[PDB]
Design a protein around this ligand. Structure first.
Ligand SMILES: CC(C)CN(C[C@@H](O)[C@H](Cc1ccccc1)NC(=O)O[C@H]1CO[C@H]2OCC[C@H]21)S(=O)(=O)c1ccc2c(c1)OCO2
Ligand SMILES: [Cl-]
Ligand SMILES: [Cl-]
Ligand SMILES: [Cl-]
Ligand SMILES: [Cl-]
Ligand SMILES: [Cl-]
Ligand SMILES: [Cl-]
Ligand SMILES: [Cl-]
Ligand SMILES: [Cl-]
Ligand SMILES: [Cl-]
Ligand code: NA
Ligand SMILES: [Zn+2]
Ligand SMILES: [Zn+2]
Ligand SMILES: [Zn+2]
Ligand SMILES: [Zn+2]
Ligand SMILES: [Zn+2]
Ligand SMILES: [Zn+2]
Ligand SMILES: [Zn+2]
Ligand SMILES: [Zn+2]
Ligand SMILES: [Zn+2]
Ligand SMILES: [Zn+2]
Ligand SMILES: [Zn+2]
Lengths: 99, 99
């Protein structure tokens, strides 16, 4: 796949079977998703963005299906206005930014 | 150039001749930079992200030199914690995100 960036590079994905709209985000170290419920096996993590900080719940070894691939990766759940797949997942997928 | 995303894709840009380190960010619609003054001819607008919102000042037709190319693009100034070159600039440079 190739994303030419004239539109947002948004795709659908599944996280532990739960469907989401996600933004492929080279400006994010981590992957942050709102509204999904991954249960009680988490550690708290503090994440900073453009407007300040939020608490998140960090889940490791989560099954992710996106772009016809299946990977296991860390997902943080919390109050992001857009669900983002950051570089932890982009590298797991083998993605690159090119010019 | 290829950015493999194992590390943050950060490069040196010159904005109206001033050097700034910028994050190449596919998750950003717009480009936002701090620490530089671009003057009185702007439009104020609010942007949102993780943590909340910030006020920005939007400037059109700003001289940008980055990745050995020179372009004219829209830049916001505001109190962003990191300087961000979003899709408006990435597309002017001919960048793509690939799997
Ligand atoms: C949240 C996504 C949808 C939007 N953002 C760009 C992101 O790439 C942002 C860019 C960013 C990077 C660093 C600090 C602040 C923002 N990264 C970010 O929030 O990442 C967080 C998750 O992983 C961690 O690693 C980096 C911070 C954490 S943003 O910075 O808020 C932003 C930039 C340009 C914009 C905009 C919002 O609205 C219109 O134009
Ligand atoms: Cl397209
Ligand atoms: Cl596109
Ligand atoms: Cl398009
Ligand atoms: Cl599934
Ligand atoms: Cl933390
Ligand atoms: Cl963070
Ligand atoms: Cl905006
Ligand atoms: Cl010139
Ligand atoms: Cl490819
Ligand atoms: Na004016
Ligand atoms: Zn397009
Ligand atoms: Zn599945
Ligand atoms: Zn959408
Ligand atoms: Zn992190
Ligand atoms: Zn982080
Ligand atoms: Zn962690
Ligand atoms: Zn915008
Ligand atoms: Zn010049
Ligand atoms: Zn120069
Ligand atoms: Zn400040
Ligand atoms: Zn490929």
């Amino acid at each position: 796949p190739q994303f030419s960036l004239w539109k947002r590079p948004v795709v659908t994905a599944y996280i532990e079977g739960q469907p989401v709209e996600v933004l492929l985000d080279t400006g994010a170290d981590d992957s942050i998703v709102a509204g999904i419920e991954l249960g009680n096996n988490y550690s708290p993590k503090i994440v900073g963005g453009i407007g300040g900080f939020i608490n998140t719940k960090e889940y490791k070894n989560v099954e992710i299906e996106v772009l016809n691939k299946k990977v296991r990766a860390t997902i943080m759940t919390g109050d992001t206005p857009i669900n983002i797949f950051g570089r932890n997942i982009l590298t797991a997928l083998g993605m690159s930014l090119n010019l």
